[PDB]
Design a protein around this ligand. Structure first.
Ligand code: VNV
Ligand code: MG
Lengths: 151, 151
């Protein structure tokens, strides 16, 4: 595997471990992975980290009632660029009515970028992904990992 | 002020804001600032971050019962190098006997480096600094700022 490919695999393992930990504990989370559409305008709204990825840091960011937990984490390649970032709210009618602002923000950024956003529901622990204006809910651990590997 | 001086002051303000919040909430914390003696061997025991300093990230790191809260944060070159790092425990018989391992770790690293370590007590919220093998206890906010500026 090339170093780039190994680094990607490590980042995916770190994300999936953090998401699984948060889902089990009903820690709401909103994590956008920048792809080819640059997200600088949204990164600049948050608190800069420019930090190496780890499952530990991802989990620490989203702990309820802490400075960094409200808003989106935006990742650039193998780094956490910023936390507590603004994303635009979607008005799509295909967002389940019971869902709150994290899911609407995720679909919103997915309408104007090619990013992949993962959401953990604080109500149910369900994991969802927003991409290209669509929300895919109730993902298994295996499905999330496959989606990330394909991305 | 020059860019380097403005950056140093921003970091001092971020540190003091985090320490003040943790003192108020009696959140135990251990934060070592590397100086001329390299601390790479201790940095390598922790979770790599290489993150920009912010008061928000410092607070999020030390929240109890989280992945990153157990061990020292080590700062280097105006960044958070790593969290959850090992520091050596002092065997000094001249540390106040009611203090536990966080304070002994701070004194211990200060015995073998020129670093400055800040400790927040989880028992009292008291703020102390270890340097040169001595622990300076029960600091006011002004006293901590003076130490950081002198350092
Ligand atoms: N801001 C914040 C503080 C805490 C906490 C929890 C247990 C013990 C001490 C502090 N959790 O979130
Ligand atoms: Mg389904």
């Amino acid at each position: 595997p090339t170093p780039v490919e190994e680094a990607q695999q490590k980042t995916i393992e770190a994300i999936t471990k953090a998401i699984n930990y948060m889902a089990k504990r009903r820690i709401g989370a909103l994590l956008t992975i920048e792809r080819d559409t640059g997200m600088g305008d949204y990164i600049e709204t948050g608190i800069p980290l420019n930090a190496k990825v780890s499952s530990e840091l991802l989990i620490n960011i989203f702990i309820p009632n802490t400075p960094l937990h409200d808003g989106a984490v935006i990742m650039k390649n193998n780094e956490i660029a910023a936390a507590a970032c603004y994303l635009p709210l979607s008005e799509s009618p295909f967002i389940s009515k019971e869902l709150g602002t994290r899911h609407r923000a995720a679909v919103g950024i997915s309408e104007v970028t090619d990013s992949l956003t993962i959401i953990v529901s604080e109500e149910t622990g369900g994991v969802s992904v927003a991409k290209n204006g669509d929300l895919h809910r109730e993902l298994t651990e295996e499905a999330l990992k496959e989606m990330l590997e394909a991305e």
